[PDB]
């Protein structure tokens, strides 16, 4: 049945995007650490930053691995109820990963902002863009959580089908907003590196 296989295929693609975004995020973290070791903003605060980074990085990896497991199960089910259930759970997995990545992304904005305080005016214009996309992704996440709740409720007790399709749209929108934020943090870091020494 092509509708559901089409959703499973798109879920694989969203997960792939999440992994590529995790990779970029990780590079931004490393880049921020290199800059901080040179610039040295303010230290216990940076130790807690580092701890938080490590916590969320661990979380994200676990979510990605669980998503990879669920993806494999759904693709098995396609060959084989359980499919709809697995598709909903995969939407939950992807949403948790996006939420955790968004927190990680906000930790890098914190780091970038601490550094740009010492290298000092298009920071304010960079700020406005960060805020705009932060608000957008927050509202997309909020809407995605509500939809997930409705789908899960219906799954237990179609509005289910419609809710699943709309949730695909919600997730992709949020991943797309995250991409824009990543381009913004990449820009901020290059701009900082260009100004040192």
């Amino acid at each position: 049945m092509q509708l559901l296989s089409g959703i499973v295929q798109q879920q694989n693609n969203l997960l792939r995007a999440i992994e590529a975004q995790q990779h970029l995020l990780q590079l931004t973290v490393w880049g921020i650490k290199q800059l901080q070791a040179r610039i040295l903003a303010g230290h216990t605060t940076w130790m807690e930053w580092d701890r938080e980074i490590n916590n969320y990085t661990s979380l994200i990896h676990s979510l990605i691995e669980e998503s990879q497991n669920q993806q494999e199960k759904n693709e098995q089910e396609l060959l084989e109820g359980q499919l709809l259930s697995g598709i909903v759970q995969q939407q939950n997995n992807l949403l948790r990963a996006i939420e955790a990545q968004q927190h990680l992304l906000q930790l890098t904005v914190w780091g970038i902002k601490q550094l740009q305080a010492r290298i000092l005016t298009t920071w304010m214009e960079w700020d406005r863009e960060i805020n705009n996309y932060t608000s957008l992704i927050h509202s997309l996440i909020e809407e995605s959580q509500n939809q997930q709740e409705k789908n899960e409720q219906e799954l237990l007790e179609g509005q289910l089908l419609s809710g699943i399709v709309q949730q695909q749209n919600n997730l992709l929108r949020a991943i797309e907003a995250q991409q824009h934020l990543l381009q913004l943090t990449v820009w901020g870091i290059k701009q900082l590196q260009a100004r040192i020494l």
Partner: antibody, heavy 119, light 108 residues
């Protein structure tokens, strides 16, 4: 993936710049370290660059002696080591890490560049 | 971070080899293991928590407990004779670090 420039013979006090041309991935997804090995000895990490930002950090032992650079249009990383001494005699490797988002290990290595420092 | 490895370890063909590396601090996921043969570049054998790259035999596995990582080679072959290095990264500073290396001899 990683092809380095040829062997070098240098005198104490000179400089050497070693190159590493990367082929077959996405440049902006690269992360490189330089790593050296004296003959019969262990590996010694020298420093890193993240080419998409051009950000670097170096082991403290080499602060003020080593520069790591990368060029996107030629897809090449460089290590320049100044004020050479006989103890800098070693094979020098470029190495790429972050092959995937959770691979911090060095997945790809250059063939190595021997640099012999002698009066 | 200072990573301590035994200078040498020896094994009989078919016997299991275990090479320790002590000294890393959390997160241990930054760590990796390398095989190096004479006149060759090092080869990544394990990264993070027992992840094997493509083309690396299943007989190689990584484990960890506290500040001590262990490379295990079950049913070791003569071709497993090599230097093995552990490495990791310091979390705050992203300084790399290698252990001193372990020469593995397969007896025969």
């Amino acid at each position: 993936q990683l092809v380095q420039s040829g062997a070098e013979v240098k005198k104490p006090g000179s400089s050497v710049k070693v190159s590493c041309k990367a082929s077959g991935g996405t440049f902006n997804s690269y992360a490189f370290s330089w790593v050296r090995q004296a003959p019969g000895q262990g590996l010694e990490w020298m420093g890193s660059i993240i080419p998409i930002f051009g950000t670097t950090n170096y082991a403290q032992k080499f602060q003020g002696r080593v520069t790591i650079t990368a060029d996107e249009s030629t897809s090449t990383a460089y290590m320049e080591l100044s004020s050479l001494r006989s103890e800098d005699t070693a094979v020098y490797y470029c190495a790429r890490y972050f092959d995937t988002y959770n691979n911090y290990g060095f997945a790809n290595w250059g063939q190595g560049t021997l640099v012999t420092v002698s009066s | 971070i200072e990573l301590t490895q035994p200078p040498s370890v020896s094994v009989v063909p078919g016997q299991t080899a275990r090479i320790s590396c002590s000294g890393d601090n959390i997160p241990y996921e930054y760590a990796s293991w390398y095989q190096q043969k004479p006149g060759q570049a090092p080869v990544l054998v394990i990264y993070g928590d027992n992840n094997r790259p493509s083309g690396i035999p299943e007989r190689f596995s990584g484990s960890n407990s506290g500040n001590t990582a262990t490379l295990t080679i079950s049913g070791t072959q003569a071709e497993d004779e090599a230097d093995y290095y552990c490495a990791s990264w310091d979390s705050m500073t992203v300084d790399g670090v290698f252990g001193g290396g372990t020469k593995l001899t397969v007896l025969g």
